[PDB]
Design an enzyme around this catalytic site. Structure first.
Site, PDB file in Angstrom:
ATOM      1  N   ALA A  30       0.805  -1.213   0.000  1.00 14.31           N
ATOM      2  CA  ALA A  30       0.000   0.000   0.000  1.00 14.31           C
ATOM      3  C   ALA A  30       0.843   1.269   0.000  1.00 14.31           C
ATOM      4  O   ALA A  30       0.295   2.346  -0.253  1.00 14.31           O
ATOM      5  CB  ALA A  30      -0.936   0.008   1.210  1.00 14.31           C
ATOM      6  N   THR A  48      -1.636  -0.616   4.463  1.00 11.13           N
ATOM      7  CA  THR A  48      -2.361  -1.880   4.521  1.00 11.13           C
ATOM      8  C   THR A  48      -3.250  -1.937   5.754  1.00 11.13           C
ATOM      9  O   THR A  48      -4.466  -2.137   5.646  1.00 11.13           O
ATOM     10  CB  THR A  48      -1.376  -3.049   4.518  1.00 11.13           C
ATOM     11  OG1 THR A  48      -0.548  -2.980   3.351  1.00 11.13           O
ATOM     12  CG2 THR A  48      -2.117  -4.377   4.535  1.00 11.13           C
ATOM     13  N   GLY A  49      -2.667  -1.695   6.931  1.00 13.89           N
ATOM     14  CA  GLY A  49      -3.411  -1.779   8.175  1.00 13.89           C
ATOM     15  C   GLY A  49      -4.559  -0.799   8.271  1.00 13.89           C
ATOM     16  O   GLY A  49      -5.468  -1.005   9.079  1.00 13.89           O
ATOM     17  N   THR A  58       7.466   6.616  12.204  1.00 13.43           N
ATOM     18  CA  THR A  58       8.289   6.149  11.094  1.00 13.43           C
ATOM     19  C   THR A  58       7.636   6.414   9.742  1.00 13.43           C
ATOM     20  O   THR A  58       7.826   5.644   8.798  1.00 13.43           O
ATOM     21  CB  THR A  58       8.586   4.660  11.247  1.00 13.43           C
ATOM     22  OG1 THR A  58       7.389   3.906  11.021  1.00 13.43           O
ATOM     23  CG2 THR A  58       9.116   4.356  12.640  1.00 13.43           C
ATOM     24  N   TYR A  79      11.138  -4.241  18.679  1.00 14.22           N
ATOM     25  CA  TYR A  79       9.747  -4.625  18.470  1.00 14.22           C
ATOM     26  C   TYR A  79       9.410  -5.983  19.070  1.00 14.22           C
ATOM     27  O   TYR A  79       8.232  -6.248  19.329  1.00 14.22           O
ATOM     28  CB  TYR A  79       9.422  -4.640  16.970  1.00 14.22           C
ATOM     29  CG  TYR A  79       9.278  -3.286  16.277  1.00 14.22           C
ATOM     30  CD1 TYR A  79       9.021  -2.115  16.985  1.00 14.22           C
ATOM     31  CD2 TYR A  79       9.386  -3.192  14.896  1.00 14.22           C
ATOM     32  CE1 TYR A  79       8.885  -0.904  16.344  1.00 14.22           C
ATOM     33  CE2 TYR A  79       9.248  -1.982  14.247  1.00 14.22           C
ATOM     34  CZ  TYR A  79       8.998  -0.842  14.977  1.00 14.22           C
ATOM     35  OH  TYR A  79       8.862   0.367  14.336  1.00 14.22           O
ATOM     36  N   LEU A 117     -16.404 -12.954  26.818  1.00 18.30           N
ATOM     37  CA  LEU A 117     -16.276 -11.777  25.966  1.00 18.30           C
ATOM     38  C   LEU A 117     -17.551 -10.944  25.953  1.00 18.30           C
ATOM     39  O   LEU A 117     -17.482  -9.712  25.905  1.00 18.30           O
ATOM     40  CB  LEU A 117     -15.908 -12.185  24.540  1.00 18.30           C
ATOM     41  CG  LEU A 117     -14.498 -12.725  24.294  1.00 18.30           C
ATOM     42  CD1 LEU A 117     -14.354 -13.111  22.833  1.00 18.30           C
ATOM     43  CD2 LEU A 117     -13.425 -11.718  24.690  1.00 18.30           C
ATOM     44  N   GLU A 130     -19.931 -10.604  28.430  1.00 17.44           N
ATOM     45  CA  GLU A 130     -20.003  -9.839  29.673  1.00 17.44           C
ATOM     46  C   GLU A 130     -18.831  -8.877  29.801  1.00 17.44           C
ATOM     47  O   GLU A 130     -18.966  -7.819  30.428  1.00 17.44           O
ATOM     48  CB  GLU A 130     -20.057 -10.772  30.891  1.00 17.44           C
ATOM     49  CG  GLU A 130     -21.089 -11.914  30.828  1.00 17.44           C
ATOM     50  CD  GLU A 130     -22.479 -11.477  31.276  1.00 17.44           C
ATOM     51  OE1 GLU A 130     -22.751 -10.260  31.277  1.00 17.44           O
ATOM     52  OE2 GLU A 130     -23.302 -12.353  31.622  1.00 17.44           O
TER      53      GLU A 130
HETATM   54  N1  GTP Z   1       5.037  -2.430  18.109  1.00 17.71           N
HETATM   55  C1  GTP Z   1       5.300  -2.736  16.843  1.00 17.71           C
HETATM   56  N2  GTP Z   1       4.937  -1.869  15.833  1.00 17.71           N
HETATM   57  C2  GTP Z   1       5.201  -2.173  14.541  1.00 17.71           C
HETATM   58  C3  GTP Z   1       5.843  -3.355  14.221  1.00 17.71           C
HETATM   59  N3  GTP Z   1       5.981  -3.402  12.879  1.00 17.71           N
HETATM   60  C4  GTP Z   1       5.442  -2.284  12.346  1.00 17.71           C
HETATM   61  N4  GTP Z   1       4.965  -1.504  13.367  1.00 17.71           N
HETATM   62  C5  GTP Z   1       4.280  -0.206  13.228  1.00 17.71           C
HETATM   63  O1  GTP Z   1       3.683  -0.127  11.951  1.00 17.71           O
HETATM   64  C6  GTP Z   1       3.712   1.196  11.463  1.00 17.71           C
HETATM   65  C7  GTP Z   1       3.907   1.179   9.954  1.00 17.71           C
HETATM   66  O2  GTP Z   1       3.917  -0.161   9.522  1.00 17.71           O
HETATM   67  P1  GTP Z   1       2.537  -0.930   9.229  1.00 17.71           P
HETATM   68  O3  GTP Z   1       1.401  -0.192   9.890  1.00 17.71           O
HETATM   69  O4  GTP Z   1       2.620  -2.348   9.737  1.00 17.71           O
HETATM   70  O5  GTP Z   1       2.390  -0.880   7.628  1.00 17.71           O
HETATM   71  P2  GTP Z   1       2.308  -2.253   6.797  1.00 17.71           P
HETATM   72  O6  GTP Z   1       1.475  -3.267   7.534  1.00 17.71           O
HETATM   73  O7  GTP Z   1       3.698  -2.777   6.534  1.00 17.71           O
HETATM   74  O8  GTP Z   1       1.592  -1.870   5.411  1.00 17.71           O
HETATM   75  P3  GTP Z   1       2.362  -0.956   4.339  1.00 17.71           P
HETATM   76  O9  GTP Z   1       2.391   0.469   4.828  1.00 17.71           O
HETATM   77  O10 GTP Z   1       1.648  -1.026   3.013  1.00 17.71           O
HETATM   78  O11 GTP Z   1       3.772  -1.473   4.190  1.00 17.71           O
HETATM   79  C8  GTP Z   1       4.854   1.892  12.182  1.00 17.71           C
HETATM   80  O12 GTP Z   1       4.446   3.143  12.685  1.00 17.71           O
HETATM   81  C9  GTP Z   1       5.250   0.966  13.314  1.00 17.71           C
HETATM   82  O13 GTP Z   1       5.197   1.650  14.547  1.00 17.71           O
HETATM   83  C10 GTP Z   1       6.211  -4.232  15.230  1.00 17.71           C
HETATM   84  O14 GTP Z   1       6.785  -5.283  14.956  1.00 17.71           O
HETATM   85  N5  GTP Z   1       5.940  -3.917  16.542  1.00 17.71           N
HETATM   86 MG    MG Z   2       3.649  -3.353   4.657  1.00 17.05          MG
END
Ligand code: GTP
Ligand code: MG
Ligand code: TA1
Ligand code: GDP
Lengths: 432, 440
Positions: free
Chosen positions: B99, B145-146, B179, B224, B252, B254
């Site tokens: 994404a 993605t998320g 980041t 991480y 879940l 309650e």
């Molecule tokens: N706590 C923690 N945060 C993570 C980790 N990996 C990624 N993140 C968080 O994810 C954010 C960005 O990565 P993602 O949200 O996972 O994005 P993605 O799932 O790779 O999807 P794309 O953006 O398309 O690559 C960052 O701000 C990180 O803080 C992890 O292993 N542990």
């Molecule tokens: Mg990704």
């Protein structure tokens, strides 16, 4: 899968590409004969990003070599890695442009462009999921600049979706090697800002300064400059090939670094640089990497970043490290250097980390800056351009090949619009 | 039968899932290859509980998980890793680019295509379950993605299943460190997903966990892995009731009933008390009162938001290990006696209590010490509004000049969606402001 098609144009582009392929083959453990003799299993995990697998377990680079002088091609073939390339991809002609952009773009290059595009089409259609193209050349030259701009325009017409990158070596204030550098630079910058998504600006003066001051090399040559550019090239694309705690694609970098479509000119940099004989004194750690990263003398574009503001930067680290440390270091860099970052983009620092460092280093990192100070370079070129266009210093050599003063005038106007665009976000004070 | 379906979207989700499934396999005695030696050792009982793991005829247990991510690399690490033989081969990988930290790419253009296959596997799993309880989706705000694929998946799950509970565990953007430069856009655009379709959304801040690791665990350079392990401990504490017998079991349903006073305020904070290193495990009793007081400390919160700047709407304490109801009642009375902790007037009860006999497990090579007792406090409070307002400010400072907007609008998204999302998040804030004002 995400794989890149590599194109090399001109003498400087060919030299940098040869060194870059040497570096990549060393990184992936590819022998000069094409066989694989690596040790780690991750080397072949993503070999298809830069290579195509042949019948006899060999790997051929996905390179396309372009020039209008057979001498450079003979130089590459008569070299340590001459046999690695596919012979059919050696597209070349005769009677080079001779430092004339009009010949490179309109007269001579217009005939070889068809063959080069045919090879590009054949290579791209064989990909599973193409990611983008990267082109290496020099803007101040002849065949390189002209045919590079022509190929960029044609490929952008053919493949609008895919990301485009360019590693451009541009003129310098002091180091001049051809008389008509401003003309070629102006027209190349016009075509580049029209039809590209990323453009890394390289300078011979900055690389010489790094060699003399940082690396302490008494007798630097073009090999060391190509070495530095190859290190930056590998650092930019490290994330596609190896796994990391926080991945980063070229598309992600383009999204995070380009706030507006015409601002896609970047200042590259690399760390560490130690000069040999001082590694024992220096302690390698993330703070040291960052401190060398943001130093003004480590940039390769011959711009002082303190003469402007950073629109946005991106750091890609390689090696085992802690995410808290790198996040904290980026925060301290932002906070301490508060006056060098735009106030309307909070946290304008992208961070990527990969777990596979280079072969001989425990930790490494690359830096991509987007700052207003780059305007100086364009301004400088514009001044020199005016100094020759006022009197038509060398103009006839271009106009004999099918050009006109209108084309030069619009190129200069577009550069002025670009420098004004960059200058807009330099002065402080603005908004809520 | 009681069970939940776990979903992991994005790199953060997949890594958190790796930590979670490591902890689960260690808890239930399941080997990385899926074989349980306890079956042949004991010859009876119930160890591979059906909450997370499904049993086959050959004695191999397979988890109820659906890992999704557009990047091949993150899931390819799993498929060639230690747990390659645990998960089903169907791993839902888009063999394309990512994404690129773009909500539009992950929601409109690239997030589709794979969505049908993901929903097909989820449908197959749901048919496999009996008495399905809910979904536990792991994502992260600020990622393309998320954000986008989570929006698609949550929408389609709401249309298809509807009644089942939907718990979200997400990493909210921090006040200071991040980041990516386009995090505010994705985070504010995910407000519709996190507010319309999710029944209960938990948020964790990376800086809070970094400070917790530094101060308590004496880890000067956390990564991480430790954050994911702490999140895994939190989720295990949440879900331990469905697996192990206890004096006061918290289901879940309650759990959700007593933590969501109104439909649009389902955003509780989380915290874990006995976060302590091996060296500091000695010299401290770690009694029930100590952990109960430690939950309410602002220093130990998992999100950068001070509880003292708001009011405690509701609270749920889930204890594990050697805990007796008398000590829990005494600790709750002591907390009510304290005045720094303010409760809304319209919730005289305030506290929910659950106890489980199974004590927490310690991952090999981890950092958390072995503790007989433990507790997780999950609290709905109005302080979270402040944590949302800071991010809101950033969005405005990035939206005044339409920075980075062309990338979003070049993937089918309309400009006005930004303003609509802004007005929506503005609403949630006003509501958290309105619900506070005490009655008169
Ligand atoms: N706590 C923690 N945060 C993570 C980790 N990996 C990624 N993140 C968080 O994810 C954010 C960005 O990565 P993602 O949200 O996972 O994005 P993605 O799932 O790779 O999807 P794309 O953006 O398309 O690559 C960052 O701000 C990180 O803080 C992890 O292993 N542990
Ligand atoms: Mg990704
Ligand atoms: C004492 C020690 O550890 O040896 C080092 C070394 O001394 C130093 C000075 C090396 C050395 O580099 C140079 O001397 C140099 C000269 C001109 C231009 C660039 C480099 C080294 O040659 C370079 C070489 O680097 C690598 O092997 C990297 O993997 C590098 N490889 C290549 O460039 C390469 C060379 C030949 C064939 C193919 C590739 C690399 C870096 C980034 C991405 C990919 C590859 C290393 C370990 C060293 C020596 C040998 C002295 C440095 O180089 C790098 C980038 O590793 C220069 O400053 C760094 C830091 C090192 O401390
Ligand atoms: N860094 C580097 N620069 C080079 C090299 N060879 C040529 N150049 C630069 O390229 C410029 C000349 O352009 P040229 O390559 O001759 O143009 P072309 O004939 O169209 O390929 C000069 O300003 C040089 O500084 C090289 O090996 N390394």
């Amino acid at each position: 899968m995400r794989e890149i098609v590599h194109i090399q144009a001109g003498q400087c582009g060919n030299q940098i590409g040869a060194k870059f392929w040497e570096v990549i083959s060393d990184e992936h453990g590819i022998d000069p004969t094409g066989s694989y003799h690596g040790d780690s299993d991750l080397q072949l995990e993503r070999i298809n990003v830069y290579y195509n697998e042949a019948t006899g377990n060999k790997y051929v680079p996905r390179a396309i070599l372009v020039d209008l002088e057979p001498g450079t091609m003979d130089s590459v073939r008569s070299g340590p890695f001459g046999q690695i390339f596919r012979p059919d991809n050696f597209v070349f002609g005769q009677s080079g442009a001779g430092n004339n952009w009009a010949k490179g773009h309109y007269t001579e290059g217009a005939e070889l462009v068809d063959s080069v595009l045919d090879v590009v089409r054949k290579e791209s259609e064989s990909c599973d999921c193409l990611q983008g193209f990267q082109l290496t050349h020099s803007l101040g030259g002849g065949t390189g600049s002209g045919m590079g701009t022509l190929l960029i325009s044609k490929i952008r017409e053919e493949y609008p979706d895919r990301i485009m990158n360019t590693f451009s070596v541009m003129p310098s204030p002091k180091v001049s090697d051809t008389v008509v550098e401003p003309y070629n630079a102006t027209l190349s910058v016009h075509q580049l800002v029209e039809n590209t998504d990323e453009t890394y600006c390289i300078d011979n003066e900055a690389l010489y300064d790094i060699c003399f001051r940082t690396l302490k090399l008494t007798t630097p040559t073009y090999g060391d400059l190509n070495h530095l550019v190859s290190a930056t090239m590998s650092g930019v694309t490290t994330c596609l090939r190896f796994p990391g705690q926080l991945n980063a694609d070229l598309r992600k970098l383009a999204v995070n670094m380009v706030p507006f479509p015409r601002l896609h000119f970047f200042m590259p940099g690399f760390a560490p640089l130690t000069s040999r004989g001082s590694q024992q004194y220096r302690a390698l750690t993330v703070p040291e990497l960052t401190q060398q990263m943001f130093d003004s003398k480590n940039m390769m574009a011959a711009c002082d970043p303190r003469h402007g503001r950073y629109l946005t930067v991106a750091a890609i680290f390689r090696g085992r490290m802690s995410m808290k440390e790198v996040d904290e270091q980026m925060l301290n860099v932002q906070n301490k250097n508060s006056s060098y970052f735009v106030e309307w983009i909070p946290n304008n620092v992208k961070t990527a980390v990969c777990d596979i460092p280079p072969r001989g280093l425990k930790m490494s990192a690359t830096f991509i800056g987007n700052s207003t100070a780059i305007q100086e370079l364009f301004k400088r070129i514009s001044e020199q351009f005016t100094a020759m266009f006022r009197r038509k210093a060398f103009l006839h050599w271009y106009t004999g090949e099918g050009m006109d003063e209108m084309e030069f005038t619009e190129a200069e106007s577009n550069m002025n619009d670009l420098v004004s665009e960059y200058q807009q976000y330099q002065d402080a004070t603005a908004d809520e | 039968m009681r069970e939940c379906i776990s979903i992991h979207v994005g790199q953060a989700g997949v890594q958190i899932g790796n930590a979670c499934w490591e902890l689960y396999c260690l808890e239930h005695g399941i080997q990385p290859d899926g074989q349980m030696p306890s079956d042949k050792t004991i010859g009876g009982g119930d160890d591979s509980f059906n909450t997370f793991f499904s049993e086959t005829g050959a004695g191999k247990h397979v988890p109820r998980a659906v890992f999704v991510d557009l990047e091949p690399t993150v899931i390819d690490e799993v498929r060639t890793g230690t747990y390659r033989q645990l998960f089903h081969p169907e791993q839902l990988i888009t063999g394309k680019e990512d994404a690129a930290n773009n909500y539009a790419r992950g929601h409109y253009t690239i997030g589709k295509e794979i969505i049908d296959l993901v929903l097909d596997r989820i449908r197959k799993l749901a048919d496999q379950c009996t008495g399905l309880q809910g979904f536990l989706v792991f994502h992260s705000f600020g990622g393309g993605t998320g954000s986008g694929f989570t929006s698609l998946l949550m929408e389609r799950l709401s249309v298809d299943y509807g009644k089942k509970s939907k718990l979200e565990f997400s990493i909210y953007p921090a006040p200071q460190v991040s980041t990516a430069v386009v995090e505010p856009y994705n985070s504010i655009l995910t407000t519709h997903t996190t507010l319309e379709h999710s029944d209960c959304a938990f948020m964790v801040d990376n800086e809070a966990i970094y400070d917790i690791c530094r101060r308590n665990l004496d880890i000067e350079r956390p990564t991480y892995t430790n954050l994911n392990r702490l999140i895994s401990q939190i989720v295990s504490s949440i879900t331990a009731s469905l697996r192990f017998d206890g004096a006061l079991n918290v289901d879940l349903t309650e759990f959700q009933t007593n933590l969501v006073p109104y439909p649009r305020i389902h955003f509780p904070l989380a915290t874990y008390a006995p976060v302590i290193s091996a060296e500091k495990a000695y010299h401290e009793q770690l009694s029930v009162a100590e952990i109960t007081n430690a939950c309410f400390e602002p220093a130990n919160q998992m999100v950068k938001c001070d509880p003292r700047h708001g009011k405690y709407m509701a609270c749920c304490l889930l204890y594990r290990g050697d805990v007796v109801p008398k000590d829990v009642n005494a600790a709750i009375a002591t907390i009510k006696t304290k005045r720094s902790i303010q409760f809304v007037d319209w919730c005289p009860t305030g506290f929910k209590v659950g106890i489980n006999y199974q004590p927490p497990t310690v991952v090999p090579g981890g950092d958390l010490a072995k503790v007989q007792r433990a507790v997780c406090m999950l609290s709905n409070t109005t302080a979270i509004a402040e944590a949302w307002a800071r991010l809101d400010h950033k969005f405005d400072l990035m939206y005044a000049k339409r920075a980075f907007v062309h990338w979003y609008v070049g993937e089918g998204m309309e400009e006005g969606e930004f303003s609509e999302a802004r007005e929506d998040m503005a609403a949630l804030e006003k509501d958290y402001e309105e619900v506070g004002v005490d009655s008169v």
